[PDB]
């Protein structure tokens, strides 16, 4: 056939769905409704623009609504879809431009509305120099504030947030990091968080841990931050405390949520309603180690969701087959890579789990420049089964993490990892790869 | 028990064996006889000493005979084992110190004699500024010649050789590369050799291809190199044309050679004689893609041999389970990694094989500094089974090659690679990893 595919949201999942569907089947009418007035941009890059490394914000968009148009795809920014007359029985789609509101129908509907910041309840959040880092507009806001220092407080020592810390220091601010749990990167085992505390500290960041924030001081302006542990003075504050999925519209039309709260999906990205798909951060994914659904709001997973929905609609054969949880981020001079489950998580799930954590190099002892390289393996006591892993390096790669993600994907034991014929040469690895050394193999 | 382990050769295979056995069972009498007067050093490092980047040649050794002694291991350099009275029936081991010759016995024998340069029959090789890069003493000889320029010819455009060209340019010389076959790195598909020709050229290296060397001109000094394509003036010439294993003493004792010419072995590194193992460059290894014995003289495989033999002897349970051929080297601003089979070799072996070759980046389009990244996949037509692949980057690393090595290890298809959840973030990968892009996925 040659019918009508409506994409709600156009950031990553949504743009992927649109771009792939129209390529795979040029008969479709493909329309994207984005509320934000930008479309198809790398949120991941926002801290590099903040920091000054990337000169202009527009650098971050992959495709313009104009290039889209050239390619058969009609994108509307600043259009919010306010209601769907689903099943029910499509029309559906009332939505809003500049001035007006109006109707549309669809044959295939891709929900790709993303995630919004998850705001803690703290009096004084509403003030003038409290910010959030999610969108292009967020970037504009911030980018205005920044030059004109002086003192920043960042709530949340998650990856973005560690990422913001570096950006603000690169922009000359003094920065203190506040975290309610005891370590930075609290969702991973503590050795890694340690490494990070030391690197933040080396670069002038103050890291307050185990800290209850009580309010943001000011008369609508923000100058403080009052905490259980004292008062942090700050004319800019960044809330970096989580995101939650944008599910509200999809519940209105009776799309089912999964246990995570994100929209449920099958290997075809299809929801519970016929003709409705979801993609990207509003959607659950099957975690392959946990053997259940999971929310993993990463941008590469959004692209793989989007592209699967896209292909499926264009009548190609395409399945999405799940995640293992691999992430990497850059914080100052560390590259921090995780995958699978941390020992704590492994334990919480009931495994009889053990961890090893080793410190190697990134190149021969004798090689000029060779840096430290840590690897963590989390495994199942008896079986040897791999459950998760971390590698940290200065390295632009390592990224060695990818090998673990590979193994986690099938069952994959410590034994299997030992048997792997990895690449040796003095500039890149010691003669035993740090993954091999960590395998069984020292403690 | 508490018997006597004798290791002939003490470079990498040999050293690993000795060190692992003594640790694993301290009751062993462990003695190493090395002919070369150095022991336990990184030949792979030699070009970085050549180039000046690593200041002194001793920086390459990992353990001194002294530190070994402290750890229960007796090493003798400048000791050649000249005969073995095998089975036969051990005394065996007549060998030679400084002055003397003498007898020893063994209960376990590890043959780790390595490999020697494989010289093409060329009149005038015997002269004064012709050199080879294999040993610590080779390193001395060249380090003497180097400062004092002026014109270098390298025969052979293998990894050492490309490695040498870089070293020599960093040391001021003009360098011309002479290769008999049509490409640099003739052993791999040609895309890769091409990228290297361009890099070599961009750094001042002249690269003569399809070139028959006829002889080394001079009166016992060398100043030329006469070739089917003209005359290359050269006061220093590096022969970098292959190695062959040192199987001579082992044949004398009736140890069996494999079809490769290297010593045959089992998963326990045991030879055909009871009590006799081999480790390192003298030893074959089972290739897991080709499902037969293979020669893969790399230093990481030597450590893996060595440590297996070692363990086995101290009566730990240990097995070596083959290789897949993964290698990586650095030539100027390229890191070049291959694994499995090139398409050529794939086809020689009779697979219905195809290849894909793609060029991506190492980091988001918008990220500062992101470089190119290429990836080659070699696969079976129908099944989708991976057969080999290459990745080249500037990257320290990528090294992504390890993922393929991983997959090659189990059967592993292009499909499987596709399903992998790798790590995305702007500094390190585009949002589709270049492995993923390559997979089915563009041509
Ligand atoms: C600072 C930062 C750094 C990051 N770094 C990384 C990294 O290093 N690696 C990585 O893999 N990921 C990273 N991410 C994650 C990235 O933002 C997402 O995971 C990815 O872009 C997936 O997006 P998506 O299309 O599902 O939706 P989102 O990017 O959440 O966007 C959906 C858009 O659709 C719109 N929409 C919502 N409701 C409606 C409606 N009712 N009608 C019409 N339109 C609507 C929204 O306004 C929104 O802008 C980072 C994110 C941030 C914020
Ligand atoms: C310039 C250069 C660069 C390299 N780069 C890399 C790289 O980037 N990555 C990688 O994986 N590999 C690399 N290698 C490979 C490395 O040399 C070997 O593959 C590795 O060290 C394995 O060694 P082995 O112990 O089996 O024996 P070898 O290293 O060949 O040494 C065994 C030693 O035992 C001695 N011996 C021999 N016969 C007798 C006898 N009859 N009695 C007593 N003693 C004896 C020899 O004199 C010799 O020095 C490189 C090599 C060179 C030369
Ligand atoms: S914060 C996380 C990041 N978020 C974002 O990426 C937001 C922006 N991205 C997007 O909006 C989508 O990713 C877009 C760009 C809309 C989707 O783009 P397309 O789906 O059109 O994808 P591409 O233009 O990247 O190309 C897709 C096809 O092109 C082949 N290909 C890509 N790159 C290469 C290289 N380097 N060499 C050879 N071929 C390449 C891909 O294989 C793909 O092929 P198919 O034809 O789809 O199989
Ligand atoms: S050109 C190719 C390279 N050639 C060479 O390597 C030549 C020189 N090398 C050698 O001679 C051998 O590799 C030597 C150094 C003699 C062998 O040394 P050992 O066998 O004693 O090995 P190590 O001292 O490296 O230690 C082995 C045990 O130590 C554990 N371990 C290593 N590194 C770490 C780090 N960074 N963090 C924690 N643990 C570490 C190894 O796992 C290994 O453990 P065991 O299981 O006890 O052997």
Short mmCIF file of C-alpha atoms and ligand atoms in Angstrom, two decimals, chain A residues 357-361 365-366 373 424 426 431-432 436-443, chain B residues 10-20 23-24 39-45 60-63 68 71 298-300 302-303 307, ligand 4:
data_model
loop_
_atom_site.label_atom_id
_atom_site.label_comp_id
_atom_site.label_asym_id
_atom_site.label_seq_id
_atom_site.Cartn_x
_atom_site.Cartn_y
_atom_site.Cartn_z
CA UNK A 357 38.13 -5.05 39.72
CA UNK A 358 41.61 -4.60 38.36
CA UNK A 359 43.80 -1.84 37.25
CA UNK A 360 45.91 -2.18 34.15
CA UNK A 361 47.35 0.15 31.53
CA UNK A 365 54.35 -0.34 30.64
CA UNK A 366 57.24 1.05 28.47
CA UNK A 373 42.86 1.35 32.46
CA UNK A 424 47.92 -6.84 21.03
CA UNK A 426 52.39 -1.85 22.66
CA UNK A 431 50.38 -8.01 26.26
CA UNK A 432 47.57 -9.44 28.32
CA UNK A 436 41.84 -11.00 29.91
CA UNK A 437 43.71 -10.06 33.09
CA UNK A 438 40.39 -9.35 34.91
CA UNK A 439 39.08 -12.73 33.64
CA UNK A 440 39.19 -15.26 36.55
CA UNK A 441 42.70 -14.24 36.63
CA UNK A 442 43.96 -11.86 39.51
CA UNK A 443 41.45 -10.32 42.08
CA UNK B 10 63.48 -17.15 27.58
CA UNK B 11 61.99 -14.51 25.50
CA UNK B 12 58.19 -14.56 25.76
CA UNK B 13 56.73 -18.07 25.57
CA UNK B 14 59.62 -19.33 27.70
CA UNK B 15 59.47 -16.61 30.23
CA UNK B 16 55.68 -16.97 30.76
CA UNK B 17 56.02 -20.69 31.34
CA UNK B 18 58.76 -20.42 33.87
CA UNK B 19 56.99 -17.61 35.75
CA UNK B 20 53.55 -19.27 35.84
CA UNK B 23 54.04 -19.44 41.06
CA UNK B 24 51.60 -22.21 40.58
CA UNK B 39 65.58 -12.50 28.66
CA UNK B 40 61.92 -11.40 29.02
CA UNK B 41 61.81 -8.27 26.86
CA UNK B 42 59.32 -6.81 24.40
CA UNK B 43 60.48 -7.13 20.82
CA UNK B 44 57.23 -5.33 19.86
CA UNK B 45 58.64 -2.21 21.54
CA UNK B 60 61.67 -2.88 27.15
CA UNK B 61 62.44 -5.74 29.61
CA UNK B 62 59.70 -6.91 31.93
CA UNK B 63 61.68 -8.90 34.49
CA UNK B 68 63.46 -13.86 38.63
CA UNK B 71 61.11 -15.32 42.69
CA UNK B 298 52.41 -12.84 17.98
CA UNK B 299 53.48 -12.01 21.46
CA UNK B 300 50.07 -12.23 23.02
CA UNK B 302 53.21 -16.52 23.04
CA UNK B 303 52.17 -15.45 26.59
CA UNK B 307 51.09 -19.61 30.67
S1 LIG C 4 56.58 -9.07 22.07
C1 LIG C 4 55.35 -9.85 23.14
C2 LIG C 4 55.51 -9.51 24.60
N1 LIG C 4 56.62 -10.25 25.14
C3 LIG C 4 56.74 -10.32 26.45
O1 LIG C 4 55.78 -10.21 27.21
C4 LIG C 4 58.13 -10.52 27.00
C5 LIG C 4 58.18 -10.30 28.52
N2 LIG C 4 57.10 -10.91 29.29
C6 LIG C 4 57.38 -11.97 29.99
O2 LIG C 4 58.51 -12.31 29.98
C7 LIG C 4 56.31 -12.70 30.73
O3 LIG C 4 55.06 -12.10 30.35
C8 LIG C 4 56.58 -12.58 32.24
C9 LIG C 4 56.56 -11.10 32.59
C10 LIG C 4 57.84 -13.28 32.74
C11 LIG C 4 55.44 -13.29 32.93
O4 LIG C 4 55.10 -12.60 34.12
P1 LIG C 4 54.06 -13.31 35.07
O5 LIG C 4 53.55 -14.53 34.34
O6 LIG C 4 54.69 -13.32 36.46
O7 LIG C 4 52.90 -12.28 34.98
P2 LIG C 4 52.65 -10.94 35.77
O8 LIG C 4 53.63 -10.54 36.78
O9 LIG C 4 52.15 -10.02 34.73
O10 LIG C 4 51.42 -11.41 36.62
C12 LIG C 4 50.63 -12.52 36.30
C13 LIG C 4 49.56 -12.52 37.37
O11 LIG C 4 49.29 -11.23 37.90
C14 LIG C 4 47.96 -10.83 37.70
N3 LIG C 4 47.90 -9.39 37.30
C15 LIG C 4 48.60 -8.89 36.24
N4 LIG C 4 48.36 -7.58 36.04
C16 LIG C 4 47.46 -7.19 36.97
C17 LIG C 4 46.78 -5.89 37.28
N5 LIG C 4 47.13 -4.80 36.51
N6 LIG C 4 45.84 -5.83 38.30
C18 LIG C 4 45.59 -6.99 38.98
N7 LIG C 4 46.21 -8.21 38.73
C19 LIG C 4 47.15 -8.38 37.78
C20 LIG C 4 47.64 -11.66 36.50
O12 LIG C 4 46.26 -11.93 36.51
C21 LIG C 4 48.29 -12.97 36.76
O13 LIG C 4 47.57 -13.72 37.72
P3 LIG C 4 47.83 -15.29 38.07
O14 LIG C 4 46.48 -15.85 37.73
O15 LIG C 4 48.21 -15.36 39.51
O16 LIG C 4 48.97 -15.67 37.24
#
